[PDB]
Design a protein around this ligand. Sequence first.
Ligand code: SF4
Ligand SMILES: [Cl-]
Length: 298
Amino acid sequence: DLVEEILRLKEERNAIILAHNYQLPEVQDIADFIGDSLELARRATRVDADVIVFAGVDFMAETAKILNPDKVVLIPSREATCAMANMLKVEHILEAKRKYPNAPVVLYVNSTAEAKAYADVTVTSANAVEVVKKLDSDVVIFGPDKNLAHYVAKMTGKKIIPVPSKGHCYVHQKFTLDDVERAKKLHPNAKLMIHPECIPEVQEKADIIASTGGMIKRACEWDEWVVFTEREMVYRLRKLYPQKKFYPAREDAFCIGMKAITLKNIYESLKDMKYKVEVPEEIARKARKAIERMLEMS
Ligand code: SF4
Ligand SMILES: [Cl-]
């Protein structure tokens, strides 16, 4: 019984389990806190636990370690990785900076810790517009997601240069205008909640544009929603609001990296104290500073 074993080991290890909204239902069901990556990392800084088991992808566990350097942070599989974050290389940032010497570098939190060390400021989907509006430059380097960059450009009026030029999340890139039309045909009383990682023409059809935390916040505004994000978010929303109706926008919006994590490797993570997440000191210090500037600018 993996659940019973996990619960006992969590107590033995003085551990907290943090799960991203895209984790499998059986993982969400054993987590202590569920949410998006930055919010989970922040909430753990106020928790008296010795060990964090991060049920999510590598950059999320890295952010938890950056903000909780004094805790052991475990990732259940090193194959839990983010294809979008991995598209942004330090080279891309430096090459972009050498080309636009006066442009600030704004890093979406969905990005490696190493990339964060070169950012002037980080952003979440929820604070990206307010942060970028406060930058003096009308030209901004933004990464790694070109679709979020386009949304920020629209809402700020600034020129936003995506780094890398084609950075994107393959899960969110799948959604199309045909998916929007089908959603309205199959669920005519639903409103559309759309992640800003979706393509701009799909963003324009949204009733609300928000990442997963904002979807949870704004779900109270209507009783039926079609959800344009990774499909496990539907499970999360149905558990939060059993009185509402939620429908996935697609049959295939599946993040392979998120689903590298299973109940069995959460058990093995606590049993064997693996896999330990470490962040080099200089990267961690610089990544912290960009995050702190984000919170001051928002
Ligand atoms: S859903 Fe997209 S952005 Fe999130 S971890 Fe998976 S690949 Fe990365
Ligand atoms: Cl994600």
